[PDB]
Each structure stands twice: as C-alpha cells, then as structure tokens.
Amino acid sequence: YDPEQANRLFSERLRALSQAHDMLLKENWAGATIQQICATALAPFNSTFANRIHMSGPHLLVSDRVTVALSLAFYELATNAVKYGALSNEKGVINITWAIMEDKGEKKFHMRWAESRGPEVMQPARRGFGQRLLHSVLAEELKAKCDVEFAASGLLIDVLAPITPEVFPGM
Numbered sequence: 001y002d003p004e005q006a007n008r009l010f011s012e013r014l015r016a017l018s019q020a021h022d023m024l025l026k027e028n029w030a031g032a033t034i035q036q037i038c039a040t041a042l043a044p045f046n047s048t049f050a051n052r053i054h055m056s057g058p059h060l061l062v063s064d065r066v067t068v069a070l071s072l073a074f075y076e077l078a079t080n081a082v083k084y085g086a087l088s089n090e091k092g093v094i095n096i097t098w099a100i101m102e103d104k105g106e107k108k109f110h111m112r113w114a115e116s117r118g119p120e121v122m123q124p125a126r127r128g129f130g131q132r133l134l135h136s137v138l139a140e141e142l143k144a145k146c147d148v149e150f151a152a153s154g155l156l157i158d159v160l161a162p163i164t165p166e167v168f169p170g171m
C-alpha cells in the first residue's frame with residue numbers, strides 16, 4: 001500500500017466521473033419532466049423487458065441538475081434490478097410512481113421505485129460507495145429525505161422533497 005497513490009487514483013476517477021456528469025448536464029440544460037426523464041433513462045430496459053417497468057405520476061417539470069441526478073439514479077437502479085432484483089427473473093416487475101402531496105399546507109414531491117414479484121432479497125444486502133453516492137447526489141439536488149428499504153419482497157426507494165422553484169420550475 002501507498003496512501004499518496006490511493007488518493008491520486010480516487011481524484012482521477014472522481015475527475016473522470018465529473019467529466020461524464022458535465023456531458024449530461026450540458027445535454028440537459030432545459031430540464032425535463034419526471035415522465036420524459038423516466039421514459040428516456042429506462043428506454044434500453046423497456047426494449048429487453050417489455051411490460052415489466054411501469055411509470056405513473058403527474059406532469060411535473062424538474063431542473064437540469066435533478067434531471068441529470070434522477071437519470072443516473074433510474075439507470076443505476078434498473079442496472080441492479082437486472083443483476084439482483086425484479087428484472088433478474090421472468091415474473092418480477094418495477095413500479096415507479098410519483099405525486100404532489102400535502103402536509104396540511106406544505107406541498108411535497110413524493111417518488112417511489114418499487115420492485116415486486118422478484119427473487120428474495122437476502123438479508124446482508126448493503127450498498128457500496130457508488131449507489132450510496134448517487135442516492136446522496138439525488139437527495140441533495142432534490143433537498144429530499146431519501147429512504148432505501150431492502151425488503152425481502154423487493155427493493156423499495158422513497159423520496160420526499162419540499163417543492164421549491166429552483167428544483168421544480170414554475171412552482
């Protein structure tokens with residue numbers, strides 16, 4: 001081991017990641033709706049796994065940063081769904097649902113990624129740096145409380161965010 005080389009490798013890999021994220025940020029300058037984000041990111045998966053990914057929610061416009069964060073989150077979640085969850089078998093299904101909530105006056109954005117009818121989700125299922133990082137980036141861009149549950153019945157991700165015009169333009 002050499003700590004100086006380990007730090008250098010981490011920076012170089014981080015810079016490579018930032019470069020890839022800027023390519024996405026430039027492309028997505030106008031933002032997008034959850035529907036457009038969701039359908040666009042999950043299009044390669046809808047080809048391979050027809051009628052196994054379901055999306056439902058109101059028409060809702062989101063900023064450039066959230067469109068990028070959410071795209072990679074959706075892509076990364078589907079990548080794992082094929083390797084471990086609902087898309088690893090033949091009967092497993094993914095339900096992406098979002099909506100505009102109300103806490104007796106305060107308007108909130110809620111989103112759920114729900115995997116069902118997939119294989120059993122075995123007890124020591126613990127996230128690595130990448131997914132942890134993506135979830136953290138997504139939650140920070142949304143200024144959201146994010147809950148990740150590795151339920152035996154299937155992975156359940158919940159996002160609860162306050163509505164601000166920075167994150168949700170024209171709101």
Ligand SMILES: Nc1ncnc2c1ncn2[C@@H]1O[C@H](COP(=O)(O)OP(=O)(O)CP(=O)(O)O)[C@@H](O)[C@H]1O
Binds near residue numbers: 086121154
């Ligand atoms: N949709 C899903 N359904 C069931 N288990 C899942 C899952 N997504 C992830 N897991 C579990 O979480 C573990 C950790 O996954 P993660 O992708 O976070 O890190 P990793 O670094 O262990 C593998 P990799 O980075 O190659 O995907 C996986 O090994 C798997 O057991």
